[PDB]
Amino acid sequence: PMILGYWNVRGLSHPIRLLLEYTDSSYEEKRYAMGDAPDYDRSQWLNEKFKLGLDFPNLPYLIDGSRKITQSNAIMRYLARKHHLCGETEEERIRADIVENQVMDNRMQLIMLCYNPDFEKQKPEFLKTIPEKMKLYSEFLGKRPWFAGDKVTYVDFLAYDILDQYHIFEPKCLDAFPNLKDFLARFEGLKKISAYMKSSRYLSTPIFSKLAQWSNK
Amino acid sequence: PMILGYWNVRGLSHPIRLLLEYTDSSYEEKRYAMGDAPDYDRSQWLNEKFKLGLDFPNLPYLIDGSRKITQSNAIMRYLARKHHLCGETEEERIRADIVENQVMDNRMQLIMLCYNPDFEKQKPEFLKTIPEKMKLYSEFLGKRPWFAGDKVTYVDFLAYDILDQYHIFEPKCLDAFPNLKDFLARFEGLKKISAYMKSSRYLSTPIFSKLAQWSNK
Ligand SMILES: N[C@@H](CCC(=O)N[C@@H](CS[C@@H]1c2ccccc2-c2ccccc2[C@H]1O)C(=O)NCC(=O)O)C(=O)O
Ligand SMILES: N[C@@H](CCC(=O)N[C@@H](CS[C@@H]1c2ccccc2-c2ccccc2[C@H]1O)C(=O)NCC(=O)O)C(=O)O
């Protein structure tokens, strides 16, 4: 079957794990362990980083038969082409392209806070930027069932993940945006997703490595 | 015409500027001025950031009639689709997807150094990581004229830009990689490219905004 390599955290791999499940993919994972500090040992990964035939070794990586891919969004796009989960029209394509890039920014923003040694001090100000971020997703989605428009697409998995992560971070952040709350429930209600969420494979936390200041365990 | 909006620096907009040129796109630009330190005033942008109908306001932005796009890779992909500069096969699409994301990472690493107050002290270690990055690119391209294969695609624009930046940063960095040196010289050689580089519109440097420790003017 296919192999997905990543750390044994949620990190940025949740959309891939969820899409492998939604597509009924035949896969197994390598969940690399990282030692405790000070070292935060990575040998488990580093012993084999350059022995996998990856063009640009990284985590996550996906091996599918002959094919070897890195870069979470490239993996996501490969799986979407594979299972016909791309935007179909130019309009859907541009909406998807924008969402894909926008989620990664909002993800980088959260990461930058969560790896800041001055976390608690920076938090209040980070929390203040949430309503603005959420408002932009809320308005973009509007009354659409999915981000692209009519059909679930791979960007719905990206959006689910980052919305959920912000929701975990600040539990009241969706209260003013019922459509986003509805979107999370609609996503979570997709048959294979609901079954996966209750399964032994599910990893909702920790989101970050032991290194982080938040969701590090 | 289309309108491209971005700061009055190269930043991450280079590939876009270059693709508009290559596609003989009819466009006008809005190059937003940023104040000097210690304030680095952003009022020229900030005055109309929320007045342009962008779903997720940002720089760069591209307006093409009713269509409004943000996210530099979504801009690139819109233009790519419009001019048939995407991968044509599954193999080409995967190569282009990985390159796209890989450039952004190599770009984010350069920014991470170049905005660090400890830039000078951090430089030794950064320089040490350079050969590894260049080797990956070199090996990936291999004998192909272009990153996706036999034909130019939009990812040649992204790769050209980051390789050039690295090269500007560390001049001797491509000495070992004739293929990289050759790819730069090949890209710069494209008619529309050669012309643009000599035009009134070209802005090679500064690479970064005034807030940076390097290529900030
Ligand atoms: N843009 C690429 C980025 C690939 C990349 O940086 N990989 C990380 C793991 S991802 C990392 C992480 C490591 C542990 C815990 C959490 C994260 C994480 C979470 C959210 C978002 C970014 C991150 C990141 O902090 C890694 O450990 N790489 C193998 C190595 O360097 O040898 C992508 O989209 O795939
Ligand atoms: N993923 C998104 C990234 C959009 C984004 O962050 N935009 C920056 C300008 S781009 C910024 C930058 C600003 C000035 C000069 C250089 C850059 C730059 C250069 C290399 C790499 C990243 C950067 C970035 O640090 C900006 O000023 N935004 C409007 C604002 O906040 O009101 C994209 O790919 O398009």
From Swiss-Prot, chains A, B:
It is found in: Cytoplasm. Residues 1-87 form the GST N-terminal domain. Keywords: Cytoplasm, Lipid metabolism, Olfaction, Phosphoprotein, Sensory transduction, Transferase. The modification Phosphoserine is found at residues 66, 204, 209. One of its GO terms (biological process) is sensory perception of smell. Conjugation of reduced glutathione to a wide number of exogenous and endogenous hydrophobic electrophiles. The olfactory GST may be crucial for the acuity of the olfactory process. Participates in the formation of novel hepoxilin regioisomers. This is Glutathione S-transferase Mu 1. It comes from Rattus norvegicus (Rat).
